[PDB]
């Protein structure tokens, strides 16, 4: 029974490294991304400094 | 405009409301190993290769880690706010660009002494040795209570003639999960009825409550525990299971305010 | 329209990057302590059972 | 308790650099907006000398 | 947020790294000395039932 | 004795290696921060001359 409730235990609680780590990865990639995205985005007012205005 | 920066702050006040609640539950978090830490040492203060000398070595421990409960009660605080003593209360977290949208959050207390971190404990008058056995016709013991809901229970169990005093105990255990029941040195048969399963007094009917006699129910709690005896030790197993179901049930309420908080903050947002 | 006092592509991209960057918190928090319920917001019911366990 | 107080302290004190460098960029366009204006307003008066006065 | 002052992630990866050397010095020395029971931090009761066996 | 002796020693005079290269990073995240902010501050002048002065 020790071994089989760690069992169980481990299904529930332990973390599954081959899964997190993609999800650590995925989650990298979104950042850069986003963050390319919004240096990106921040230059879009500049448009409106070329009316001259 | 005025709705936009009340967004804002809107934010903020669901963060400030995580904050809180994520430190109530990081204490919490020791409170839960500590307990644990009681409950393996209880389980082996019940033995019986114990002597008196041990047992008062692993009480030593508990008497330590009762006080770093409540240690850990007193002083856990939020800049100065203490939240797992009781003062806390209730505190309504207004997340809304409008007055009136607010969200209540109670952190209870987590001191030992607490009454939801105990029950209520009933011993037998009879002791019963080694060559007592369940007599057929007297072998019926019925539980009369309330659940913590308040609906009435009237559980009957109906031990096994032959069995001795510690296969009555587990016989008990195995049929009801709403009260815990173990035998003393003196072979008495203790039931606990944790404060977090049933309310009230426990009844006690048929045959078998007739040849044991279980007195009155004295309240216990995680403070009260003193693992100096075999009958001691037992029933802080128990009340030690009470005390982790109620820090439990208080970090799902905590767990699910913060679920619901980052909901709020997600669609504040948008 | 070209406006500078607001531009909501940055609001989009903020958004999406603090959504990341929580889930690579998450991600990290796992991967260290390597179990995958740390809290009761990461599962309730599941970490009564696995204190239980 | 230290890593909670710290987030806390975090989400009140410390700066989102998202969020500030593009406030930073807005703040900078309309600083070149408003001298690109000052400059077309410094010649409404000018307009007086071509009414030979 | 993306924010420099503090990491709470460094933070916690810092505290379960401390925990996991700390069962490694513990692992260690039960190991070397061939006792579990080498203070009576590791289990008070056993080691007076211990010193007495 | 010696060797407690020497754990409390280390207690209060080593460095902590994992917290020391954290503090370490995030400087060098903040003088390039600051460095940063300060040739962009170096122009603000700048706009002096745009004013026909």
Same mark, same amino acid.
């Given at each position: ?53 | ?16 409301? +995580? ?24 389980? *082996? ?28 009660? @007193? ?5 100065? #706010? !203490? ?7 209730? !505190?309504?977290?207004? +997340?809304?660009?409008?007055?009136? @949208? ?5 952190? !209870? ?13 009933? =011993? ?5 040795? &080694?060559?007592? &056995?369940?007599?057929?016709?007297? #072998? ?14 009237? +559980?009957? =169990?109906?031990? !096994? @003639? ?9 016989? +008990? ?5 709403? =009260?815990?029941?173990?035998? #003393? @040195?003196?072979?008495? $048969? *203790? ?35 003193? =693992? ?15 005390? $982790? &179901? ?11 305010? *913060? ?10 947002? #948008? | ?35 995958? %319920? ?10 009564? %059972?696995?204190?239980?366990?």
């Amino acid at each position: 029974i020790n071994e089989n409730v760690n069992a169980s235990k481990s299904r529930i609680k332990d973390t599954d490294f081959a899964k997190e780590t993609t999800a650590l990865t995925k989650s990298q990639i979104l950042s850069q991304a986003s963050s390319s995205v919004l240096a990106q985005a921040k230059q879009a007012p500049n448009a409106a400094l070329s009316l001259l205005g | 405009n005025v709705q936009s920066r009340g967004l804002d702050v809107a934010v903020r006040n669901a963060n400030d409301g +995580i904050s809180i609640a994520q430190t109530a539950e990081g204490a919490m978090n020791e409170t839960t190993n500590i307990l644990q830490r009681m409950r393996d040492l209880s389980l *082996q203060s019940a033995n019986g290769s114990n002597s008196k000398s041990e047992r008062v070595a692993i009480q030593e421990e508990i008497t330590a880690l009762n006080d770093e409960l409540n240690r850990i009660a @007193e002083t856990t605080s939020f800049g100065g #706010n !203490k939240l797992l003593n009781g003062t806390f209360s209730t !505190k309504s977290f207004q +997340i809304g660009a409008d007055n009136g @949208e607010a969200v209540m959050l109670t952190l !209870k207390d987590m001191r030992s002494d607490n009454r939801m971190m105990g029950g209520t404990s009933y =011993v037998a008058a009879e002791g019963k040795d &080694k060559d007592w &056995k369940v007599q057929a016709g007297a #072998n019926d013991i019925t539980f009369t209570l309330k659940d913590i809901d308040g609906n009435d229970q009237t +559980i009957t =169990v109906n031990a !096994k @003639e032959g069995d001795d005093i510690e296969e009555v105990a587990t016989y +008990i255990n195995g049929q009801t999960d709403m =009260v815990k029941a173990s035998v #003393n @040195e003196k072979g008495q $048969l *203790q039931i606990f009825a944790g404060n977090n399963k049933v309310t009230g007094d426990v009844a006690f009917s048929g045959g078998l409550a007739g040849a044991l006699n279980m007195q009155a129910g004295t309240a216990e709690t995680v403070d009260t525990i003193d =693992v100096t005896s075999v009958g001691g030790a037992q029933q802080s197993v128990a009340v030690i299971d009470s005390a $982790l &179901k109620y820090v439990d049930s208080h970090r799902a309420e905590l767990g699910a305010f *913060q679920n619901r908080f980052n909901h709020a903050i997600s669609n504040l947002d #948008n | 329209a070209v406006n500078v006092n607001t531009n909501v592509a940055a609001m989009t991209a903020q958004r999406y990057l603090t959504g990341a960057t929580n889930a690579q918190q998450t991600s990290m928090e796992r991967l260290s302590s390597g179990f995958k %319920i740390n809290s009761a917001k990461d599962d309730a019911a599941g970490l009564q %059972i696995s204190n239980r366990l």
